[PDB]
Amino acid sequence: YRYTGKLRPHYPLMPTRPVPSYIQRPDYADHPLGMSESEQALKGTSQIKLLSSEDIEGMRLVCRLAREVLDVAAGMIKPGVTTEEIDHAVHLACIARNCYPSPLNYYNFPKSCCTSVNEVICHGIPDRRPLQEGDIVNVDITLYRNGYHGDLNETFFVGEVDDGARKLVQTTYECLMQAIDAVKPGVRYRELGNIIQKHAQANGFSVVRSYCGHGIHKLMHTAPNVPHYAKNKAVGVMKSGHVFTIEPMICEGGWQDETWPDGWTAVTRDGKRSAQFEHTLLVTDTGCEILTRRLDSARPHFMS
Ligand SMILES: CCCC(CCC)[C@H](N)P(=O)(O)O
Ligand SMILES: [Co+2]
Ligand SMILES: [Co+2]
Ligand SMILES: [K+]
User: Fold this and answer.
1) What are phi and psi of 173, to 5 degrees?
2) Which residues bind a protein per the record?
3) CB 130 within 8 A of CB 79
4) How many A from CA of 6 to the centre of ligand 2?
5) Ligand 1: residues whose CB is within 6 Å?
6) What's the gap in Å between 247 CA and the centre of ligand 3?
């Protein structure tokens, strides 16, 4: 394998972290290949679930807890801390909240969160590499509680970063907020990518195409599929009761991605940097509730 950038995996990994048996587990947790019976059963569906009041409560809770855990991880970002150390803290933080770390054994994913440094687009595996001054790092948190998953991520600065890093992360955040702002009943899911690409491109960045936002509730990933690029073919129209994510990945260079031989780590083919933010959103009668919103600050971590 020829790496696309300077980053390399830092192995061996610590042995897999166990979750106490009293934490309720999603169906794939114990599947030998980490496959989900219920996602298999609904694979290929276009029908978007209208959540019940009890579902909405379940989603509010799990998403609030996911936010808390992401916030635990943000508090750790600094030069010298390994992504593994971050994952350990995130794993304990999930357990402490009576939640299962959703990524753990999802299609055999080895860790409890995704850490994506620099040219990693998404799904980086926490490992022995210490964070370095000037890195950007996304931490992606997904938690599972009482039958519900809650999904969010933020990109962070590691010490002082260059102007190019500032601009990429800022623009990425602005792309997310511009898309969220459009969400309300009657809007086509395919329109969000127009908004995202328009802003990214205006700033000289490209929009990853291979990974999309998604419905989320009882399944981790389900309808609708939500592309972040312009003129996509997404099916569906927003209605009050819909729950989905928007999670744009934006890049310094080209949009093209490839996967490391670990089967997960998605990197820019050119080796240039990529940033992402993600919220889980509930469509309301009037607009949208940001279920994974920070409660104790109006701003994401990179802005302070
Ligand atoms: C590799 C795992 C993928 C998933 C989380 C897994 C439950 C991510 N949080 P995503 O949907 O890519 O935001
Ligand atoms: Co996520
Ligand atoms: Co997601
Ligand atoms: K990245």
Assistant:
1) -65, -40
2) 123, 221
3) yes
4) 24
5) 102-103, 106, 109, 114, 122-123, 140, 142, 151, 214, 220-221, 247, 278
6) 6
Tokens 């496959």 belong to residue: 35
Domain ranges in the chain? 1-304
Among 302, 75, 299, which residue's Cα sits nearest to residue 169? 302
User: What's the CATH number of domain 1-304, 1.10.150.120, 3.40.50.300, 3.90.230.10, 3.40.30.10?
Assistant: 3.90.230.10
Question: For the residues of 11-68, what is the DSSP string, one character each?
Answer: -PPPPPPP--TTS---GGGGSTT---HHHHHHTT--PPP---HHHHHHHHHHHHHHHH
Resolution in A: 1.8
100: tokens are: 């299962």
- Among 107, 140, 172, the mutation site with the greatest number of ligand 1 atoms within 8 A of its Cβ is 140
Residue 183 Cα to ligand 4 middle (Å): 26
What was the experiment behind these coordinates? X-ray
